Amino acid sequence: SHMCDAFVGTWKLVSSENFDDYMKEVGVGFATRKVAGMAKPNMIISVNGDVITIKSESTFKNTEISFILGQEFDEVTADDRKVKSTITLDGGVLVHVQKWDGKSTTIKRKREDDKLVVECVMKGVTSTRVYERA
Ligand SMILES: Cc1ccc(C)n1-n1c(S)nnc1Cc1ccccc1
């Protein structure tokens, strides 16, 4: 076992708050915000050795990232930002920091009860996205 075990599985979005506002803060344009905000993604998280894979799948975009904790990688986000990402585990929270164009956003994922809660922060704006097991 590893502590990241509680994240592994197939998850489906059950609620969202403030995601449009988060996307505005990140710089996402109108049409992408509308289509991305309508998406009902499934998140598939798996671990193989030291490599964690997170897939996001929806009618808007299918993405896949694989990474080792603490080891920077380059990522193309669903909204087509080219970012440099680093993901760490901080007291049981997966903390994903994305840097681009002198900007930064942080995505935190944690288990709470039977949920996987995703908190997306860009400056003072937070969106909370709740996933449950599929
Ligand atoms: C905000 C975020 C971070 C990581 C992932 C996978 N997600 N995500 C969630 S949660 N729901 N849709 C997405 C893709 C998404 C990402 C950025 C902008 C628009 C859409």
Swiss-Prot record:
Pfam families (UniProt xref): Lipocalin
Binding-site list for a fatty acid: R129, V130, Y131
Motif (Nuclear localization signal) on chain: 24-34
GO process annotations (BP): brown fat cell differentiation; cellular response to lithium ion; cellular response to tumor necrosis factor; cholesterol homeostasis; fatty acid transport; long-chain fatty acid transport; negative regulation of DNA-templated transcription; positive regulation of cold-induced thermogenesis
Chain positions found as Phosphotyrosine: Y22
Subunit structure comment from the entry: Monomer. Homodimer. Interacts with PPARG.
SUPFAM superfamilies found in the cross-reference section: Lipocalins (SSF50814)
Keywords attached to this entry: Acetylation, Cytoplasm, Lipid-binding, Nucleus, Phosphoprotein, Transport
Protein name per the record: Fatty acid-binding protein, adipocyte
UniProt GO MF annotations: fatty acid binding; hormone receptor binding; long-chain fatty acid binding; long-chain fatty acid transmembrane transporter activity
Free-text comment about domains: Forms a beta-barrel structure that accommodates hydrophobic ligands in its interior.
Lineage: Eukaryota, Metazoa, Chordata, Craniata, Vertebrata
Modified residues (N-acetylcysteine): C4
PROSITE patterns reported in the protein's UniProt record: FABP (PS00214)
Species name: Homo sapiens (Human)
